[PDB]
From Swiss-Prot, chain A:
The chain holds residues 142 to 248 of 463 of the full protein. Core subunit of respiratory chain NADH dehydrogenase (Complex I) which is composed of 45 different subunits. Component of the iron-sulfur (IP) fragment of the enzyme. Interacts with NDUFAF3. Interacts with NDUFAF7. Interacts with CERS2. This is NADH dehydrogenase [ubiquinone] iron-sulfur protein 2, mitochondrial. Disulfide bonds: none annotated. Core subunit of the mitochondrial membrane respiratory chain NADH dehydrogenase (Complex I) which catalyzes electron transfer from NADH through the respiratory chain, using ubiquinone as an electron acceptor. Essential for the catalytic activity and assembly of complex I. Redox-sensitive, critical component of the oxygen-sensing pathway in the pulmonary vasculature which plays a key role in acute pulmonary oxygen-sensing and hypoxic pulmonary vasoconstriction. Plays an important role in carotid body sensing of hypoxia. Signal peptide: none annotated.
UniProtKB/Swiss-Prot annotation, chain B:
The chain crosses the membrane at residues 24-45. It comes from Bos taurus. It is found in: Mitochondrion inner membrane; Nucleus. Accessory subunit of the mitochondrial membrane respiratory chain NADH dehydrogenase (Complex I), that is believed not to be involved in catalysis. Complex I functions in the transfer of electrons from NADH to the respiratory chain. The immediate electron acceptor for the enzyme is believed to be ubiquinone. Involved in the interferon/all-trans-retinoic acid (IFN/RA) induced cell death. This apoptotic activity is inhibited by interaction with viral IRF1. Prevents the transactivation of STAT3 target genes. Complex I is composed of 45 different subunits. Interacts with CARD15, but not with CARD4. Interacts with STAT3, but not with STAT1, STAT2 and STAT5A. Interacts with OLFM4. This is NADH dehydrogenase [ubiquinone] 1 alpha subcomplex subunit 13. Belongs to the complex I NDUFA13 subunit family.
Length: 107, 67
């Protein structure tokens, strides 16, 4: 599930060794996607629990809203889920024009 | 120079959690239940007693003939 919460535990585990603080624009993105993957676990942690139990309809009622969020991942990094996006040198590249009237539209 | 952060336009949406759309509570319920229930019993005694009147009418034709 986690794509930006993993690699958050790696670059921050490497930048301490290398005597680097990351630049300040970069830190506002690691908190943004680092506080967007929690809106992927805490959707999957309830629905998949509610499927073993055996309820059908809260599995389909929330993943159809989940699709509005993978368009972000594809727009910023490289792919559907597995993105080599956080680097040890901060963020790979800047997120393009958009994604600020989209997230505010989403949230 | 073409970076993101907009000047204005924000909400937010709530973190609130409420939808108390009640709902006819507190002794208003059990009141539509009892009165409509006796209404169904009130519909009785005007049909079963009425069919009982026809029931003696049905047995009447049997007893009048058969000598």
């Amino acid at each position: 599930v986690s794509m930006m919460c993993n690699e958050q535990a790696y670059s921050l585990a490497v930048e301490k060794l290398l005597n680097i603080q990351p630049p300040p624009r970069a830190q506002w993105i690691r908190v943004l996607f680092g506080e967007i993957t929690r809106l992927l676990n805490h959707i999957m942690a309830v629905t998949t629990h509610a499927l073993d139990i055996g309820a059908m309809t809260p599995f389909f009622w929330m993943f159809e809203e989940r699709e509005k969020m993978f368009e972000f991942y594809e727009r910023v990094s490289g792919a559907r889920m597995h993105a080599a996006y956080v680097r040890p040198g901060g963020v790979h590249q800047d997120l393009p024009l958009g994604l600020m009237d989209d997230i505010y539209e989403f949230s | 120079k073409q970076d993101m952060p907009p000047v204005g336009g924000y909400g937010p949406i709530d973190y609130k959690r409420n939808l108390p759309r009640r709902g006819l509570s507190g002794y208003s319920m059990f009141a539509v239940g009892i009165g409509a229930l006796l209404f169904g019993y009130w519909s009785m005694m005007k049909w079963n007693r009425e069919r009982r009147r026809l029931q003696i009418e049905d047995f009447e034709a049997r007893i009048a003939l058969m000598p």
